[PDB]
Design a protein around this ligand. Structure first.
Ligand SMILES: CCn1cc(CC(=O)Nc2ccc(Oc3ncnc4cc(OC)c(OC)cc34)cc2)cn1
Length: 305
């Protein structure tokens, strides 16, 4: 489940322990076969007696030993990572006197994929009007900033020897001040009813975001996360369109990927962003850029713009 690090060997700092009786649950934000993410109010988490809204990940009674272990492993990884501005941050946990509860920060605008889809008809490639500034129009400047923030968060993950394995716009959250945060819905996503996940063997996998070595050899590395970032760039500069449009995942798809077929630039991508996508999609993982190199490339593009 984790390539370089074994999360079962990672420690859990008991400084994160929070009393479960101080949590009041609200609506369900997302749910899978064995897990769910719920909106909650945490009392006494702030130094003053002020309450705050949090997100809580938990298992359903349908979960088995495998899922119980996986939620505990997620908690250890989050505790091990520490705080980063471009990653969804750990706030606390409930490990004693009941099922395990993982408490993370609430992101007011939800997932990036749905945000892009809602903003599709309110997109401005050029500059926003001073009077129409209240309307909240999405611009090319916002898209370049989102690409930069996601590369930054990914460079941090790699420096900690962490591989995501499911990088996509659906696993990026949007909060205040146009801040994006890398996340992983994991067990709280209904993968059975999501057409972006395909039946391949005994698994349901996100094939259209996967590097060839992950599809044909089950290998996940720093370089395979870079390929998925390239697919995420295509989603972003297409304003949330599905990748490889009009093409189903079948024998013909696997053959074309192996033979070197690649998507052409999405409608709103600057040429230098499409240049990044092409290198992320190199058949040789050694020829792909690192997330650090991607960060430096986008940094130059922003300064020039
Ligand atoms: C990259 C390292 N890493 C982090 C993890 C843990 C993790 O990412 N868990 C996670 C993911 C998504 C969650 O869902 C939401 N959280 C906050 N706010 C939301 C707001 C929402 O709508 C307004 C909403 O709608 C559907 C969902 C929201 C909650 C927890 C694993 N690996």
């Amino acid at each position: 489940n984790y390539s370089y690090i074994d999360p079962t060997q990672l420690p859990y700092d008991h400084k994160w322990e929070f009393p479960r009786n101080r949590l009041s649950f609200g609506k369900t934000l997302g749910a899978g076969a064995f897990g769910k993410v719920v909106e909650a109010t945490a009392q006494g988490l702030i130094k003053s007696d002020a309450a705050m809204t949090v997100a809580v990940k938990m298992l359903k009674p349908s979960a088995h030993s495998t899922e119980r272990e996986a939620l505990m492993s997620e908690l250890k990884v989050l505790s091990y990572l520490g705080n980063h501005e471009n990653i969804v941050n750990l706030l606390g946990a409930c490990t004693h006197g009941g099922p395990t509860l993982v408490i993370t920060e609430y992101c007011c605008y939800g997932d990036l994929l749905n945000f892009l889809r809602r903003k599709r008809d309110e997109f401005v490639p050029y500059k926003v009007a001073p009077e129409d500034l209240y309307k909240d129009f999405l611009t090319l400047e916002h898209l370049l900033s989102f690409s930069y923030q996601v590369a930054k968060g990914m460079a941090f993950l790699a420096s900690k020897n962490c591989i995501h394995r499911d990088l996509a716009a659906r696993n990026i959250l949007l909060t205040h001040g146009n801040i994006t945060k890398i996340c992983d819905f994991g067990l709280a996503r209904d993968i059975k009813n999501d057409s972006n996940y395909v039946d391949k063997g005994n698994a349901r996998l996100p094939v259209k975001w996967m590097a060839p070595e992950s599809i044909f050899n089950s290998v996940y590395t720093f370089e395979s996360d870079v390929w998925s970032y390239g697919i995420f760039l295509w989603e972003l500069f297409s304003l949330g369109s599905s990748p490889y449009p009009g093409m189903p995942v079948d024998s013909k798809f696997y053959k074309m990927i192996k033979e070197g077929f690649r998507m052409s630039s999405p409608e709103y991508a600057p040429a230098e962003m499409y240049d990044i996508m092409k290198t992320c999609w190199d058949a040789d993982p050694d020829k792909r850029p690192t997330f650090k190199q991607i960060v430096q490339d986008i940094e130059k593009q922003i300064s020039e713009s």
